[PDB]
C-alpha cells in the first residue's frame, strides 16, 4: 500500500507526519517491515525528504497515483 | 367696505393748472405696506410734486401720506417712476413688521400718496391703476401687505373718473 507509513491500512496526513519524523530520525522506527517499504514512494531504494515531498503532494491530490 | 382709491380734486382745468390726485386706502386689515403702478398720458399730463411743482423723476416719492409714519418700525420708501412714459411706480413698507404686529393697533385707513398732475393740454384723458410686468399677481397694478409680510386681497380697486377737456 504505497504511502501507508504507519501501516494501518490508510494513506493520510498521519503517514506524512510520521514520515517527517522518521526522516529526521526523531522516531527511530516505522511500525513494520511493510511500513519501511510503503514509505519509499518513488521506489528509489532510499527513504528521505523526497518521499516526504511526494507523499505531501499526493495527499493534496496534485499527484494522481503514487508508486511513480 | 375695503378699497384702494384714486380721487381727483377737480374735474377740469386750464393748461398749466395742477390737478391733485389723492391715493387712499379704506379698511385694509393689518396694513403694513404697498406697491402701486399708476399710468397717465405724458403728452397731456405731467407728474408733479403738488407742493413745489417740480417734475417727478424716476426716484421721486409722492408726499402726503397719513399712515405708516411710526418710525419705531422702520418705514422705507422706494420710487421707480418712468414719467417719460407716463408711469408712476412706488412702494412703502414698515421694516420691523413684527414689532408693529406685536402692538396690536393696526393703521387701516388713510392717505398713501398725493400726486400733482400739471395740465399740458385741454384734451380728454385718463389716469389709471394698471397691471405691470413688474408686479405679477397684483390686482390692477396694486399690491397691499399686512404685518405678516403677506399680500392682502379682496379689496376694491376704485379708479378715478375720466378727466374731461
Amino acid at each position: 500500500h504505497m504511502g501507508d507509513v504507519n501501516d494501518d491500512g490508510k494513506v493520510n496526513s498521519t503517514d506524512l507526519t510520521l514520515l517527517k519524523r522518521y526522516v529526521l530520525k526523531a522516531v527511530s522506527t516505522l511500525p513494520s517491515s511493510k511500513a519501511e517499504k510503503n514509505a519509499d514512494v518513488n521506489r528509489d531504494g532510499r527513504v528521505n525528504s523526497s518521499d516526504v515531498t511526494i507523499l505531501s503532494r499526493y495527499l493534496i491530490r496534485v499527484i494522481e497515483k503514487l508508486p511513480i | 367696505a375695503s378699497s384702494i382709491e384714486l380721487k381727483f380734486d377737480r374735474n377740469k382745468g386750464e393748461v398749466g393748472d395742477i390737478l391733485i390726485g389723492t391715493v387712499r386706502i379704506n379698511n385694509i386689515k393689518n396694513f403694513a405696506g404697498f406697491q402701486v403702478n399708476i399710468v397717465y398720458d405724458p403728452k397731456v399730463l405731467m407728474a408733479v410734486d403738488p407742493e413745489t411743482g417740480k417734475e417727478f423723476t424716476s426716484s421721486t416719492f409722492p408726499p402726503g401720506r397719513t399712515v405708516l409714519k411710526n418710525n419705531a418700525y422702520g418705514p422705507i420708501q422706494i420710487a421707480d417712476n418712468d414719467p417719460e412714459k407716463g408711469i408712476l411706480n412706488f412702494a412703502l413698507a414698515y421694516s420691523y413688521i413684527a414689532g408693529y404686529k406685536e402692538t396690536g393697533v393696526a393703521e387701516e385707513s388713510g392717505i398713501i400718496a398725493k400726486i400733482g398732475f400739471k395740465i399740458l393740454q385741454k384734451k380728454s384723458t385718463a389716469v389709471k391703476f394698471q397691471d405691470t410686468l413688474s408686479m405679477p399677481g397684483a390686482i390692477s397694478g396694486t399690491q397691499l401687505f399686512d404685518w405678516d409680510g403677506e399680500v392682502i386681497t379682496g379689496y376694491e380697486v376704485i379708479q378715478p373718473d375720466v378727466l374731461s377737456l
Binding site: 504507519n6 490508510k10 493520510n12 496526513s13 498521519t14 506524512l16 507526519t17 510520521l18 517527517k20 519524523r21 526522516v23 529526521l24 526523531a26 505531501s56 495527499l59 493534496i60 491530490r61 496534485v62 | 403694513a32 405696506g33 404697498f34 406697491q35 422702520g74 422705507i76 422706494i78 421707480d80 411706480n89 412702494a91 413698507a93 414698515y94 421694516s95 420691523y96 413688521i97 413684527a98 410686468l133 413688474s134 408686479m135 405679477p136 399677481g137 399690491q143 401687505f145 405678516d148 409680510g149 403677506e150 399680500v151
Partner: protein
C-alpha cells in the same frame, strides 16, 4: 462536547463581495494535534475561491510549511493538509480556534440563497503521539443576499422656506438646502420636496451638529442630534423652517440685505438687473412683495432660531 470538532464557519455578502469563511478547531486535547486532512466541497457557480489563509492555530513561523491546500474548481473541491513540519512536535496545534480562513468572492451572477460549504471527505486528525483522534464535523457556507449592507446610519428630515409661494414654484424654493454634519465631510442637499437624507453616518450617541445653509438664507444650526441608528430630525408635516434674507452673508437680516434687493427693484425675468435668487418667491419679478418676505425676519440672527 469536549471531543475534537472541525467546523466550517458561515458568512454573507452581496454578489461581487469578497467574504471570509473560517474553519475552526474545537476540543483540541492537551497532547496537541499534529496532523489532519480532509476535503471540503462547494459551489463554484456561486463562490470563487480566492485563497485559503492558514489560521492563527498554525504556529510554524512559516505556516505554509506545515499547512497546505489545493483548490479544484472543476472537481468542486478544496483539499486541506496539515502536517506539523518541525518533525519534533513543536508546531502542533495546542489551542481551540481558527485553523484556516477560506477567502472567496461571490460571483457576480450568483443566485440569492444559502450556498453550502461542506466537509465532504475526511482523512484523519491525530495527536502529538500520532494517534488518530475521533473528530466531529460541522458544515457551513455563505448566505448570498441582495440586501445592500451599509456604512451605517441615515440622517434625514424635511426643510421648509418660511414664506408663501405658488405651488408651481415649490420645486425651486424647496430644493437646494445643504445640510451638513459639522466636523465631518458628510452632507446632503434637499430635493424638490424639501427632503434630505445623509447616508453613511457613523454611529454617535454623543450627538452631532447639523448646519443647514443656502445662498440668501440665514444659516441654521441644530445641535445634539444623537445617532444610535437611522435618525429623522424633522417630518414633512412639521419641517425645519428656514428664514430668507441673509443676502450679504453675515448672520443678520438687516438693511444691508434689503439694500441688495432694492438695487434690483422692479427687474423682471430677462431684465438685466434681474437675479433669480433675489426674486425670493420666484414669481418672475423683484418687487416690494419680495422685500416684505425678507421683513418677516428683519433684525434676526442665526441664534434666533430654536435649538430643537
Amino acid at each position: 462536547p469536549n471531543k475534537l470538532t472541525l467546523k466550517i464557519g458561515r458568512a454573507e455578502g452581496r454578489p461581487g463581495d469578497t467574504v471570509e469563511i473560517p474553519v475552526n478547531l474545537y476540543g483540541v486535547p492537551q497532547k496537541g494535534i499534529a496532523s489532519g486532512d480532509f476535503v471540503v466541497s462547494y459551489d463554484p457557480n456561486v463562490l470563487e475561491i480566492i485563497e485559503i489563509e492558514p489560521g492563527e492555530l498554525i504556529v510554524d513561523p512559516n505556516p505554509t510549511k506545515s499547512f497546505d491546500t489545493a483548490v479544484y474548481p472543476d472537481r468542486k473541491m478544496i483539499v486541506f493538509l496539515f502536517a506539523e513540519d518541525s518533525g519534533t512536535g513543536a508546531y502542533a496545534i495546542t489551542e481551540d480556534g481558527v485553523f484556516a480562513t477560506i477567502v472567496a468572492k461571490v460571483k457576480e451572477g450568483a443566485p440569492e440563497g444559502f450556498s453550502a460549504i461542506e466537509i465532504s471527505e475526511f482523512g484523519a486528525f491525530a495527536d502529538n503521539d500520532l494517534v488518530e483522534v475521533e473528530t466531529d464535523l460541522i458544515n457551513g457556507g455563505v448566505l448570498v443576499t441582495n440586501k445592500p449592507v451599509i456604512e451605517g446610519y441615515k440622517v434625514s428630515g424635511y426643510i421648509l422656506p418660511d414664506f408663501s409661494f405658488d405651488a408651481t414654484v415649490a420645486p425651486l424654493v424647496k430644493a437646494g438646502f445643504k445640510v451638513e454634519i459639522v466636523g465631518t465631510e458628510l452632507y446632503a442637499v434637499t430635493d424638490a420636496n424639501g427632503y434630505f437624507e445623509i447616508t453613511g453616518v457613523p454611529a454617535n450617541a454623543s450627538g452631532y451638529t447639523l448646519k443647514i445653509s443656502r445662498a440668501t438664507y440665514l444659516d441654521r444650526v441644530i445641535a445634539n442630534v444623537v445617532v444610535t441608528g437611522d435618525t429623522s430630525v424633522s417630518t414633512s408635516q412639521a419641517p425645519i423652517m428656514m428664514w430668507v434674507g441673509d443676502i450679504v452673508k453675515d448672520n443678520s437680516i438687516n438693511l444691508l440685505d434689503v439694500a441688495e434687493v432694492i438695487r434690483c427693484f422692479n427687474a423682471t425675468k430677462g431684465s438685466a438687473n434681474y437675479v433669480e435668487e433675489l426674486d425670493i418667491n420666484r414669481n418672475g419679478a423683484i418687487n416690494m412683495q419680495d422685500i416684505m418676505i425678507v421683513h418677516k425676519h428683519f433684525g434676526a440672527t442665526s441664534s434666533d432660531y430654536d435649538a430643537q
